[PDB]
Amino acid sequence: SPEDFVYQFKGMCYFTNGTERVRLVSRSIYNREEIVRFDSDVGEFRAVTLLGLPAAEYWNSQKDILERKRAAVDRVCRHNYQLELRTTLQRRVEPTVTISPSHNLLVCSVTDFYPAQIKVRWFRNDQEETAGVVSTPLIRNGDWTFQILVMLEMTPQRGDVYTCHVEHPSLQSPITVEWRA
Amino acid sequence: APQPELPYPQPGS
Amino acid sequence: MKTTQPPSMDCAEGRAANLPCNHSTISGNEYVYWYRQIHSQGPQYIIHGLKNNETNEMASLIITEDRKSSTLILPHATLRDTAVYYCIVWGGATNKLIFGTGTLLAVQPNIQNPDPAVYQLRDSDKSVCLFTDFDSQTNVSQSKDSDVYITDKCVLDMRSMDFKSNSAVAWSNKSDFACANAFNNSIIPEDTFFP
Amino acid sequence: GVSQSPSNKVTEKGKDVELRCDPISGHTALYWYRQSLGQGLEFLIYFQGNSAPDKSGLPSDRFSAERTGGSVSTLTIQRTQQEDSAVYLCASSVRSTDTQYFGPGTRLTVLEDLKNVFPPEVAVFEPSEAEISHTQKATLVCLATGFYPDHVELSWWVNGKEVHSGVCTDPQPLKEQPALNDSRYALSSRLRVSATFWQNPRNHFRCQVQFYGLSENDEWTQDRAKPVTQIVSAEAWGRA
Amino acid sequence: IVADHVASYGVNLYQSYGPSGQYTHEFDGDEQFYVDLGRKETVWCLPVLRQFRFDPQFALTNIAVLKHNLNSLIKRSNSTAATNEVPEVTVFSKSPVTLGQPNILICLVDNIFPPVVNITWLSNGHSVTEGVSETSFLSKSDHSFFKISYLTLLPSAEESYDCKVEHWGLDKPLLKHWEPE
Ligand SMILES: *[C@@H]1O[C@H](CO)[C@@H](O)[C@H](O)[C@H]1NC(C)=O
Ligand SMILES: *[C@@H]1O[C@H](CO)[C@@H](O)[C@H](O)[C@H]1NC(C)=O
Ligand SMILES: [Ca+2]
Structure with a gap:
């Protein structure tokens, strides 16, 4: 059994309503437990565990460390967000819809899309289905694309049309894929 | 260029 | 981003010294640092700021709203403040101190009683000539004779008597060296005293 | 405060030099700089703890730096050349990209031969009697002449204590023979005191010139006296 | 938060x-x-x-x-x-499975601590070295980690695939099977 000691540092930036609410949380973790952190709302280092207390007092006493950290909200978060607005926040990936039976089951495969925000509805001859429809949690592919599988318990008969309505921020008009029995 | 948050050294060592 | 500032500035002692700096191509994550160097001595940190005005025990820094310009204020400028002031932009990958041309600020002394004169001093032959108590407007030039050595004007400050004076030293081992013709190539003012 | 040892260093070409730097307590980042007269700051190498992330900046393979501590750092220059002569400055911060505070520096001078190295001839000149009667002030001049290289520290000592008020020393010395490459330098200083203070014969005025020449490691072969790191003074008492 | x-x-x-x-x-x-x-x-x-x-x-x-x-x-x-945690391994496709059309197999390894893991692909018992790519150790809110492994595919009915995950938290190497159906 090999023994291992892990140390982590996370310079976390939080953004709400664009630039209206900006928060910085600098976390120091050892191993899975956070020992000391710096929050932008308090403007000073505060220990989470007893192990973080000698570090917190050492950094709060030093003027140079405290100065840089209190300015990091505009230097790291607010500056990097301006770079994100024309890069990652501008990224729009068109979703691909596919209907395949599984027939008592019918699954609507919405794959390869960005950002994460998505709303997918099931229809049976212009009437929306809510009771017999199960959705998988928003699956993260990791390569800056998402996928979501939405199944529907259906009892088909002649003349029935099953429409999968999909809404995404990258689309002006929703994509609708139909299936006939 | 992205500006990062810098970790500071721990006393004692 | 790069900084542009005047090459030299002349300011009177006691009065506030305002040193300008131009950095129009600056970014939001960059600081406005200020360093000074007296001759070849170790550079000294003064003050630094990001968005608004900063006040230190040594000086004050005023950064504009557009952040395209900045000014360094030295409230009580003394002769010890005569140095080359560097305005540097620090941010991002910046880990090395890069000095530009700088502004060399010469604080100018207040000569309350100017009395130009050349005195001959004796060893505690050989004799030296002291051109002292002259005003800051007159310039001391090098000797035409290379066997005669003339030093540049340096400002003396007696804090105990609250008096300041400019002085130059001339000497030669040549037989025979004259004290009246020592500062001929300078040239000294008309009211210069010779005992 | 960042410490640096030695203050000045005079060596021959081909010899190896060791420059030491002690940073501020708690500072984990150390920086090595090089500076020449009338030129900007030249980066050499920097440390973060004990490891050097950027080895670039060093002029050649001859230049090396070590921080085993990892607190005190030493910069070694093997087989020194005339082009290596500069003021070597050391800077420190709590960690990388933080506010840098510089040390006093180390002035290095590398010479082709130690034969032209000479100590200064210090002479003190008593104030003129005409000056005492005219401005009611007495100015005494100090002259350090015939020294090589320009590694001198002039200080005025009145009654066994160093004085700064009413003292003026030249920032740069002048070459006695400007045509010559290994020209002997000359430096002057002035001490102004009140007529009453000078007229008291009890008061002692001493002009001290700290010369930085050859050390214990440096070898001497010439017949003349070794130009070792010595203090050459010139004293003068008051005249009633 | x-x-x-x-x-x-x-x-x-x-x-x-x-x-x-x-x-x-x-x-x-x-x-x-x-x-x-x-x-x-x-x-x-x-x-x-x-x-x-x-x-x-x-x-x-x-x-x-x-x-x-x-x-x-x-x-x-x-x-x-550091306490060795049991990782959660799940295998899925990037797009709907079509025999003869290019697809990417994704092996999501969640709740990894300490961040020391060997992820290798196996096809009908034989280890795969061609067409493999892995992402860095992605951080989590509970200060744990997750890694994603990719495999370039051309699905076939007779071709079976397994994701071998080697971690100290596991008693034996975990193999998650994937069938094109
Ligand atoms: C450290 O752990 C050892 C057991 O591994 C124990 O004997 C010792 O008392 C501990 N020291 C402290 C200061 O808790
Ligand atoms: C990963 O593989 C290496 C050999 O390449 C081996 O030494 C190590 O123990 C393996 N790790 C685990 C968790 O099995
Ligand atoms: Ca005047």
């Missing part, structure tokens, strides 16, 4: 096992880039993000500080080793 967009500038990792280290920048749970500490170069995951130039020296200095901080915490905690 609650925000529209959550970013990490950056995720700093250092462990005493290798001694191996990791430096990454995350945005909404997606890896922007990783700094190759060996080759001393920034490797971006998105082509649009390559217009920016991140200095690799930033990561190297942060690792040196994290090396100093880890040794200081071992001495303070009286050598408190």
